Amino acid sequence: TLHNIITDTENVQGSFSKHEFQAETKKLLDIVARSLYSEKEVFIRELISNGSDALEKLRHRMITTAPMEIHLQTDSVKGTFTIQDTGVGMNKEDLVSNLGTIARSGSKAFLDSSSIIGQFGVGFYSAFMVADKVEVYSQSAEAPGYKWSSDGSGVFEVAEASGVRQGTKIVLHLKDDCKEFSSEDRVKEVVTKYSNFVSFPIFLNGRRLNTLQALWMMEPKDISEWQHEEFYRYVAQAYDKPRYTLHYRADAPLNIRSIFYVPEMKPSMFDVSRSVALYSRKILIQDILPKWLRFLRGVVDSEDIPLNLSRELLQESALIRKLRDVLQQRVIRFLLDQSKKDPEKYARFFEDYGLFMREGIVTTGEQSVKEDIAKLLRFESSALPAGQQTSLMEYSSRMKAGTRNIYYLCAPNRHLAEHSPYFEAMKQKDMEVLFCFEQFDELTLLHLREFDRKKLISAETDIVVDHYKEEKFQDSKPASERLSSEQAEDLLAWMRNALVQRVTNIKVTPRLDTHPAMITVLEMGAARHFLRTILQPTLEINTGHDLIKKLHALKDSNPELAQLLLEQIYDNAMIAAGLNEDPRPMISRLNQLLTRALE
Amino acid sequence: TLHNIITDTENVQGSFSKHEFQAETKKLLDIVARSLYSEKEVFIRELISNGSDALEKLRHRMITAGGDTAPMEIHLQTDSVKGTFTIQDTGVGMNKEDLVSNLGTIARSGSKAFLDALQNQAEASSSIIGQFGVGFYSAFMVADKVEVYSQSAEAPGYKWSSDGSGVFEVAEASGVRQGTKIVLHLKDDCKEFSSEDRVKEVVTKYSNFVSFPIFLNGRRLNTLQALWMMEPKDISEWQHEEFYRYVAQAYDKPRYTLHYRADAPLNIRSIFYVPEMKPSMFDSSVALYSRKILIQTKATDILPKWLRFLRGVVDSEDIPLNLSRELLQESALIRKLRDVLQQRVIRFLLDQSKKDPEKYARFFEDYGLFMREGIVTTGEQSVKEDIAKLLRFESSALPAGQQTSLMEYSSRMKAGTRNIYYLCAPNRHLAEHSPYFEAMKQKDMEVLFCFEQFDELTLLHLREFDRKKLISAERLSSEQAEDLLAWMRNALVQRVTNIKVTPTHPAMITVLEMGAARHFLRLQPTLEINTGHDLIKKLHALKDSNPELAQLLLEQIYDNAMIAAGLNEDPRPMISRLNQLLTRALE
Numbered sequence A: 001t002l003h004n005i006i007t008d009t010e011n012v013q014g015s016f017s018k019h020e021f022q023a024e025t026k027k028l029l030d031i032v033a034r035s036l037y038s039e040k041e042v043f044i045r046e047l048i049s050n051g052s053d054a055l056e057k058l059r060h061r062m063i064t065t066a067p068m069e070i071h072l073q074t075d076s077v078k079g080t081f082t083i084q085d086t087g088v089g090m091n092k093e094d095l096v097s098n099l100g101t102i103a104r105s106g107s108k109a110f111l112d113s114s115s116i117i118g119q120f121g122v123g124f125y126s127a128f129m130v131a132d133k134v135e136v137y138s139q140s141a142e143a144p145g146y147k148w149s150s151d152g153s154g155v156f157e158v159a160e161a162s163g164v165r166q167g168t169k170i171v172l173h174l175k176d177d178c179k180e181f182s183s184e185d186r187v188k189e190v191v192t193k194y195s196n197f198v199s200f201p202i203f204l205n206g207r208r209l210n211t212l213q214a215l216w217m218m219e220p221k222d223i224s225e226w227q228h229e230e231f232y233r234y235v236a237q238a239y240d241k242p243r244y245t246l247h248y249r250a251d252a253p254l255n256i257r258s259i260f261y262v263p264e265m266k267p268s269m270f271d272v273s274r275s276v277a278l279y280s281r282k283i284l285i286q287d288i289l290p291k292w293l294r295f296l297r298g299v300v301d302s303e304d305i306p307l308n309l310s311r312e313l314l315q316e317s318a319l320i321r322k323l324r325d326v327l328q329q330r331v332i333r334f335l336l337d338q339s340k341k342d343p344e345k346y347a348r349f350f351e352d353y354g355l356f357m358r359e360g361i362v363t364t365g366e367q368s369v370k371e372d373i374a375k376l377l378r379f380e381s382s383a384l385p386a387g388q389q390t391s392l393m394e395y396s397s398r399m400k401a402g403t404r405n406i407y408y409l410c411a412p413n414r415h416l417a418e419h420s421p422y423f424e425a426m427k428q429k430d431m432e433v434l435f436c437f438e439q440f441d442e443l444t445l446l447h448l449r450e451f452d453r454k455k456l457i458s459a460e461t462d463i464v465v466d467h468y469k470e471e472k473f474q475d476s477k478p479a480s481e482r483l484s485s486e487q488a489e490d491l492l493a494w495m496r497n498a499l500v501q502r503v504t505n506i507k508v509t510p511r512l513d514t515h516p517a518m519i520t521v522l523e524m525g526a527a528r529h530f531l532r533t534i535l536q537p538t539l540e541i542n543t544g545h546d547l548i549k550k551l552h553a554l555k556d557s558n559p560e561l562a563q564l565l566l567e568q569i570y571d572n573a574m575i576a577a578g579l580n581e582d583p584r585p586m587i588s589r590l591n592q593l594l595t596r597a598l599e
Numbered sequence B: 001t002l003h004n005i006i007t008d009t010e011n012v013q014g015s016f017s018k019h020e021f022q023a024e025t026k027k028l029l030d031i032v033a034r035s036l037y038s039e040k041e042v043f044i045r046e047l048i049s050n051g052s053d054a055l056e057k058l059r060h061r062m063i064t065a066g067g068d069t070a071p072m073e074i075h076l077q078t079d080s081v082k083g084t085f086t087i088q089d090t091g092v093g094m095n096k097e098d099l100v101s102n103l104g105t106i107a108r109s110g111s112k113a114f115l116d117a118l119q120n121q122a123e124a125s126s127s128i129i130g131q132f133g134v135g136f137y138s139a140f141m142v143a144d145k146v147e148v149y150s151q152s153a154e155a156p157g158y159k160w161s162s163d164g165s166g167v168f169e170v171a172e173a174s175g176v177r178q179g180t181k182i183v184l185h186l187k188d189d190c191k192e193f194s195s196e197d198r199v200k201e202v203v204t205k206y207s208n209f210v211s212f213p214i215f216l217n218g219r220r221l222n223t224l225q226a227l228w229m230m231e232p233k234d235i236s237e238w239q240h241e242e243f244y245r246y247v248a249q250a251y252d253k254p255r256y257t258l259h260y261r262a263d264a265p266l267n268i269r270s271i272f273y274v275p276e277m278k279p280s281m282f283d284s285s286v287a288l289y290s291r292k293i294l295i296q297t298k299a300t301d302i303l304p305k306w307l308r309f310l311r312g313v314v315d316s317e318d319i320p321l322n323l324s325r326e327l328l329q330e331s332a333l334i335r336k337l338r339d340v341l342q343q344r345v346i347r348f349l350l351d352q353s354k355k356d357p358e359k360y361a362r363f364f365e366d367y368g369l370f371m372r373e374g375i376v377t378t379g380e381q382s383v384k385e386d387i388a389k390l391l392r393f394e395s396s397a398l399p400a401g402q403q404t405s406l407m408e409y410s411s412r413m414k415a416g417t418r419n420i421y422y423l424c425a426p427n428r429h430l431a432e433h434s435p436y437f438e439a440m441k442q443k444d445m446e447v448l449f450c451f452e453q454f455d456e457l458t459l460l461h462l463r464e465f466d467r468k469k470l471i472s473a474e475r476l477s478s479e480q481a482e483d484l485l486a487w488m489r490n491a492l493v494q495r496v497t498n499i500k501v502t503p504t505h506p507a508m509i510t511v512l513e514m515g516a517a518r519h520f521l522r523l524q525p526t527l528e529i530n531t532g533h534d535l536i537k538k539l540h541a542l543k544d545s546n547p548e549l550a551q552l553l554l555e556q557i558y559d560n561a562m563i564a565a566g567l568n569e570d571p572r573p574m575i576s577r578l579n580q581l582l583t584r585a586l587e
């Protein structure tokens, strides 16, 4: 039933010849020039890094004055890119060894700090992506200037040159394909993109470039609020200022140097339907954050993320997942700390960004992550004054020992919640009820399902499950102000005839006071969400209510007006339940009822 | 104020000394083994691709040599006790010379030299995957020891073995089957590749559409056919639906299918799907392949951003690949492909609106936000008007629910008409009663009614379409009303500031500026009263007789008009008060 050809049948015969790996050098040069880097512009990043390393070496040799800088020159008339650094330079041996040998890195044998970028020994050859001819003038410290020249076809020549300034100058005779790198504006774009945090001054055609400090690598105390505003505007390409700043450093289990910002501007709803930069040794390298935290701006840097040869890919997908989980938990802890510090400011944050907390809860499969994010949610309570926000953890700490459920109610505003027909039935019990006003709060709590091993249950659902338990409820009005059992059952029989296929059951409830009726569905939250795109509703009436009392008299007094009224009582309860369809078609019927009621 | 040190001051003194470029082979071996890819699991994709190429070379030789139609298979075996991963193909194999040359030399590609000598039309020219010469070394990322047994089809078997540290060994071996067998002794941290389920995940991810059958521990894996390589007619509708669910990881059906084949600027065999299900807040896309091997599960450079709602596959045998085989090189051919594909999809969707306008109306309802996003995002005015051909709006000349396009409108204009006008309103009731729509109606003419979100932002960025700019268009006696008017103006001073009289519904709400209406749905309405309605003449009578009932009645007339104007879709705040009004009315 299985088809396998792999069997241990091979046996070594005689001696073995030992060999050594070889390399096709000319083929390797073509690979680096045509297939290594996915974008041609990164040759500027490679040459600047080499200039930075050469300067870092000279700075190290200054322990035993001279200017230490990088100069870029573009000539559109001759189509040349030129970079010159004032670093250690290279002698006759170093030019042949370092530049002539692929994968040979002098920056490897130099050790023996953490300010060197090169390690692979191939980055220099990126110049042959954009240039047909490359000239290198190098003058070593102490040390006879030499000129290195090649075309990238597998051969180079070296001759002694005079008048070579200390350091190294490299001239790229650009191909006709890549004349854009003889443009000053284009070259300045690439420098700002990849090399904006170099530790040495960079000059472009005589003008000094506005390099920045890598704030994420600095001590948080040495960073002012003004410095964070400037950095936020650069990394987020924004014009405002951050309302929250998280500067997170860690060394275990992973190296982390990061800064996250929350914009003071509210998120654009156009951009929400359609964020953080990753760096290494202060060079841009472009997953890191969960989807629901995409509203964060800033920078993440981790020495534990290996880069591929082209310096544009991350190699440890298991570490990125682990990094993302660490960052996620650190942001949750930070946001909770903002709630306790300034709850008024956090109330505006949750109002502008709370939608991301709800998305994260709905789209996550891990229950512990759902509950971690749910700690950020804020609601009102029936046990607290109006306007005072609370949380699920604060609700849990008020629960008695004998309770195992968290009750909530979803209504547009505080007044509708306090005077809801579903909260009137809950007042007969002595449980606290969360008041949730946001449009997607019910969907969120439905996906959350439980918090701290306590089941979430809506007021509407609990009212229906009480029907299948004990009738432990008393009417808010004495029996003298309600219909008798003969009168109520006579009314219920008429209602079932006038509302055949519209309702499943009609019953009298002793749990209402101000409202004449209500609609109950066991899975009310799921019905309200499905309506965002004829079910089996139950109509529960208040026989103590004057409007219901008048309905019983109208079915014999004015039978046609009584049916018109019954339809409006049903519609009012459907609207109040959040289960109404289009409210426009009922306005025509309601105006007809108002004229007839007013004689 | 300038400071430049770059000056032409160098002059060569002496003679040149010529040298050839070198390679530090031991360091380079390490670079190509672990520094090329983003995932170490890639060694499985590389070794299966190499075995496919060996099988392809064997199939090509048999066109002339005429073998016997050997099995031609790829077999994988895992051993979780010894920690080994084994792959064997029944392909063309390698003698001792080819083992030392191909395996021992970095960037040496025998498949590349095979491709160069083939006739450019031969079948094997478009299906051989190798070219770089480094893919095999990815095994040393996951293995401390690599052994290769190979038997060529000529005349002796050989064993090639190495640890990946500069040297390798070659010896004669007996019992070596025709083809190549590679045994990887997995490192401790890469033991997962000795697990059957893990190997099956990698094969499915990258090599699911390899031509030749693939066996794992005696069980077949690649059962799916590359549908994009077939003739569009020879593909039935049920095959597209089943292939769509696989490529899109979906569970519905495609509402639109575009099977696109072309040869310029690149060879392209592609299949695009539009899902039948709407996008949701809780949330793959078009994958890129090359010679049946996955390059990117989410292609980035081939389609514009606004077409990210499309699902499916694009395969190109000659697109310039990055060394990592998970990226594309920067190429003018790839930039032209994106423009060709953009025009192709636009044309396809335009043909669907002619083929089935009702079905296209449902499509534009679900995915119109991507058309609108495309017009705002792109910078070329020519592609703005191309995407604008897909836009649909309502009109004042057509009844409600009927749609028209910008081209399906520039025709019905008058002869001397260089302008076209639109009105972005929440709904039709507000648009038909907009004071600016009356002005655009007195001078004949017709206004587009735009109700969708960002419809205003779309037409503003559109500026001009079809060489024509888009310019926004922005019984009760004789005088018993003022006694009711001034009473109505006073009872709701905080809601409206203008209450008029206009000759079913007792009253209606109108809004002056439409920009203020959408701000309210996230203003100053004009309550227009009719003197002839019963509730209005009843409100005038109850005004002084029953003041409590008159206040509840006025509030209900106001709220009912707000509902009829679409400015109140959740009438929950009124239910309790309406119940009090009904009770006091039926005394």
Ligand SMILES: Nc1ncnc2c1ncn2[C@@H]1O[C@H](COP(=O)(O)OP(=O)(O)OP(=O)(O)O)[C@@H](O)[C@H]1O
Pocket (backbone or CB within 6 Å): A050, A051, A054, A085, A087, A088, A089, A090, A098, A099, A104, A105, A106, A107, A108, A117, A118, A119, A120, A121, A122, A123, A124, A125, A167, A168
């Ligand atoms: N501007 C320079 N001045 C002095 N020495 C240099 C300069 N550029 C390169 N070198 C030397 O030549 C060597 C060639 O480096 P190459 O750019 O090929 O790779 P790398 O920078 O060592 O490593 P990577 O490939 O990771 O960038 C370097 O190790 C360095 O020692």
Ligand SMILES: Nc1ncnc2c1ncn2[C@@H]1O[C@H](COP(=O)(O)OP(=O)(O)O)[C@@H](O)[C@H]1O
Pocket (backbone or CB within 6 Å): B050, B051, B054, B089, B091, B092, B093, B094, B102, B103, B108, B109, B110, B111, B112, B129, B130, B131, B132, B133, B134, B135, B136, B137, B179, B180
């Ligand atoms: N069965 C086989 N498995 C792997 N390589 C083989 C096989 N038969 C022949 N070869 C040769 O080994 C060479 C090494 O290829 P590799 O280093 O992976 O780079 P590429 O695949 O791009 O040529 C191939 O070009 C191919 O000619």
Ligand SMILES: [Co+2]
Pocket (backbone or CB within 6 Å): A008, A009, A010
């Ligand atoms: Co054995």
Ligand SMILES: [Co+2]
Pocket (backbone or CB within 6 Å): A397, A398, A399, A400, A401
């Ligand atoms: Co307690």
Ligand SMILES: [Co+2]
Pocket (backbone or CB within 6 Å): B008, B009
């Ligand atoms: Co000169």
Ligand SMILES: [Co+2]
Pocket (backbone or CB within 6 Å): B116, B119, B120
């Ligand atoms: Co040819």
